[model samples]
Target: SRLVVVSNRIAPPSAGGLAVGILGALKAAGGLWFGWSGETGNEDQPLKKVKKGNITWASFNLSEQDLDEYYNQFSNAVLWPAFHYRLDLVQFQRPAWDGYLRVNALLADKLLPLLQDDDIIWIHDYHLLPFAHELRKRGVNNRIGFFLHIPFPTPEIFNALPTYDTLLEQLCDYDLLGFQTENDRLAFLDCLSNLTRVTTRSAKSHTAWGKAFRTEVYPIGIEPKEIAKQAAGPLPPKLAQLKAELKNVQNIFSVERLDYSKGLPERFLAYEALLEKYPQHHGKIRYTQIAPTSVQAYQDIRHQLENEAGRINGKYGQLGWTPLYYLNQHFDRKLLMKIFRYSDVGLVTPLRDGMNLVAKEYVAAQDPANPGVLVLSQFAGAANELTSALIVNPYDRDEVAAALDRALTMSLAERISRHAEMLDVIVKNDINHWQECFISDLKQIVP
Candidate 1:
């Protein structure tokens, strides 16, 4: 059986960065990837097909309505923020939800031709949550599975929208549904159970996205061994040279794209509060947040993160020492492994995340002989597996700050013990396991 992937967009065939991980996995696992070409041609250009490695891909363009509502309105402004538990930032509009559904239908129609007999379909992320039912409505049946890469919000957060039923109804179309954490899975199941009466079993939830379907938890982990190998393999000349001199300072690292969901402002407040309460932490340690600004056009995101980071630095800087080192540039993924290894604490405090992969990456990068502690946000999905790490509610500035202070002052033995325990979990519940486990569930249900 081959693994067939369907996401909102396909990556460049050469493969680098985020796409390389999943697409490379498919090349290793053996499968085809189908999605929007991610290419929009002008008046002179036409749609085309491309094949690379073990994957075959097709192309299509978004409609005007799709462009306006789905891309502009629903995706970024609505569901994205809401999923991250930022309901205030969410732009609610009935018209945007309508556009979202229309695009899902268009995607279902586009994906139908790429379907293969016995090929398992793995739909990805927020853009296509409702597409499974669209396929069922079109009478095309196979092993349809869905994996949400973002948080499935708690009942209160989810029910805040007027169009909750429309969105929730679409999720039941999949044969097997996967969430990032136990909390998310429980929240999802409870919401479904309360929204409409449904039978839920342990570790398995049955509900109707359109028709009754089962939901399960799959705490995503990084391939620790692979990441370590990549990190140690080679580095760009500049980064390698820079790594040589920075062996002594306690490098507490955090890497994320600049987005409201990442909780950058809250992190700043937390750091400030940490310094205010725990003056002992001064000069003993330093925190560096490598924030590469994503969605360059989204002025609000960049503006908010940069402004808050600047405010904190300006307020806390003492001659040459700044409390927070916020770098607004993307770091190479492989190079990030070395940084994670060198660091004392991986401070990843997102407001809400499906499974913050960085937390897992930091766990993977740790030296087995001498490892770093991960101070993770309880809101992240990966918190399910890496239970021993100091977990904090990112929304609470004081709590996150205290966790940072605590992680910095943690004993050497505690760090080693926590790393050992979490590393064991990462090995058992990794990307390879994620691919196999979800597919296994899908196959077992049908076969």
Candidate 2:
């Protein structure tokens, strides 16, 4: 049997982490990778297929209406916020909901012709929650699985969706479902149970709305060895000079897309609190936040972050020293790994995250002999496995500031021990292990 991977965006093998893992899986199974071309227009065009080694890449374009309603409005404005427990950001409309289903059905129609009988299809993310249901309607009875790459909200948050029941029932069409943590899995089950009768054969297996599916936790991972290599490589001249300049200063580094859920404003406030409470470290410590803009609706957050960064810097900065460095620009991933290694602290405090691969990457990129401390968010999925990290609630400025202080002053022995523990978990459950486990379970299902 061949493996078929589907996601909203189709990435080339050059992309890091998730793309690398998916490409590795595709290479191992000699499969087909199918998804959108990340284009809009010429909807009636033939499928674009590119063959590399034994794996074939297939993609299609969407019309403007489809892109706006399905992706921009429904997926981002509605489902993204709801899944991340930000119901206030959700803009639920009947037209966008209709477009979402229509896009799923359109994708099913596009992929149906390319599928083989023995193919085990794996659909990804909230953008395609109803994709399996669409395929089932078209008589593709192959074992289809789904992996949500974001948090699943509780019944209270989930029930706010206009078509929550339909979405839940559509999700039941999958033979197997995967979540980043057990909390997300239970939240999904709880949502289903509230809508219909749920019969459980085991903790992982269940029947709801007269449909059977199994749910399991598979927290995503990164290639630790690869990241370590990248981090150990010689840094660019600019970064090398900066590293030399910060020899005596404690560096706190954070990098993420400029999304509201990342808690950028809250993090800035926490940093301010750190300066106010721990005045001794004012000129000796620097916090750099690299947040590149992402979604259209995120401009407001970006502006807020800019204002907060300027305010904090102006308040505490001396004539020759600035405490906060907020760069709204993209950086090369390889360069980021190097930056992660040289820093004294890795600050990743997301309000809510699926897995936060940066947390794993930071740990992986650290030098074992003298590693940096990771001050993580309790809400991030990585905290479950990386308990050694100085975990803090993102909402509490004092708590996060205290954790930052602890991370900055952590002893080399404690940092080394914590890094070792986290690295062990990250390596044991690496990206290859994640794909292998998901595929093995997916292939075991009797279609």
Candidate 3:
């Protein structure tokens, strides 16, 4: 029996950062990864095949209309916003919903014949919530599981979706369900009780869907050893060049996608407050915000972010010192490691997050003796474990600014203590362990 992982994108498990741990585990198990090839066409295309050392990759193509309606429209515009508790941003259209279902069904039908009798099927994320149900409909009784990479909203927020119950029903078809944190797991249970009168006090459950499935928390993590190894090495050329160009200044660093949910606007406002409230540290502090474009789906949000950053930088600029440096560019993993290591403070204040691995990565990258302080957002799942970080609510500019001040002024002893604690957590709960726990539980679901 082999594990078969399914997701929207199936890249080489050895290459991509997002699911490297899962892919490594899959490769170790000599599994199959199946998904869309991220290509759009005018007509249906058969599954494309690529076999690399231990794992087989299988992906199919979708029509342009399907990509627009199913992925660009419903998945990103509707489900992403709704799951993140953004009621104002939710864009629900019947056509997109239909397209979403159609794509899931298409994937299920296309991959049905590929399933083996003893294969443990593992599905990922919100894009294909109903894929397993579609598989069940086709009489594939193999053990199947799912792991949602994003936050599962509370009952009130979830119920706002017209087809929320339908989504929940489809989710229950899996033998094992996994969420990023205990809060997410609780939210799932709360929605279950609200929709189906099923409740579990322990939070971990088996009575949700016809009493045949289990749901648990498996918080995601970064590869701390790899991050530390990279951070200890020579800086990437771009980062080395940037380091040499800058004067003797304490660099405050933040990198995120320019999205509303990440609270980029709020972070800018908080930085503005930091300058306004603390005038003495004007020329000494330099904030470098790296926010590259993610997808074409977020131009409007990107516009707002750029405008806000420009305003703040304009307001705080001096003759030779710019308080903020905001650029829309991406750095590879090595450059990112050096950037994190060179910084004195890590500002990761997201409005909400499943598990912000950046917070852990920053801790992992810090020098143990003279470690940088981590000012984290309470809303991020990482805050639950990284208790030593100066946590703040992103919405409260004053709190964020004050936390920034605290992080900047933190003593070397405290910094070392905090970094050591967070480093321990990151190393123990690294990505390999994350994949191991999920797959181990999944294997126990049936055989």
* Reference-based TM-score, model 1: 0.89
lDDT of 1 by residue, 282-308 (tens): 665677888775454366767776787
Q: Which candidate is the best by TM-score?
A: 2
Q: Which candidate, 1 or 2, would have the higher lDDT against the true structure?
A: 2
- Candidate 1, run of 10 with poorest lDDT: 39-48
Candidate 1 yields a Cα-based lDDT of 0.76
> How many pairs collide in each candidate, listed in order?
3, 0, 0
Q: Pairs clashing in candidate 3?
A: none
lDDT of 3 at 419: 88
Q: List ranges where model 1 is wrong by over 4 Å.
A: 14-31, 41-47, 52-54, 63-65, 201-210, 233-248, 295-298
Scored by Cα lDDT, where does model 2 land?
Answer: 0.92
Q: Would you estimate the TM-scores of all the predictions?
A: 0.89, 0.99, 0.96
In order, candidate lDDTs are 0.76, 0.92, 0.85
**lDDT of candidate 2 over 1-447, digit per residue (tens):** 698999998885434778877888898879999999987878898999999888999999999999999999999999999999999999999999999999999999999999998999999999999999999999988999999999999999999898999999999999999999999999999999899989988689888867778999999999899999999999898777878887889999999998868988999999999999999897899999999875669899999999998899889999999999999999998999999999999999999999999999999999999999999999999999999999999889999999999999889989899999999999999998999899989999887
Root-mean-square deviation (CA) per prediction: 3.0, 0.9, 1.8
- What is the per-residue lDDT of model 3 for residues 57-156, given as tens digits with 9 covering 90 to 100? 9888899999988998899999899888897999899999999999999889888878888999999988999998999999888889899988999999
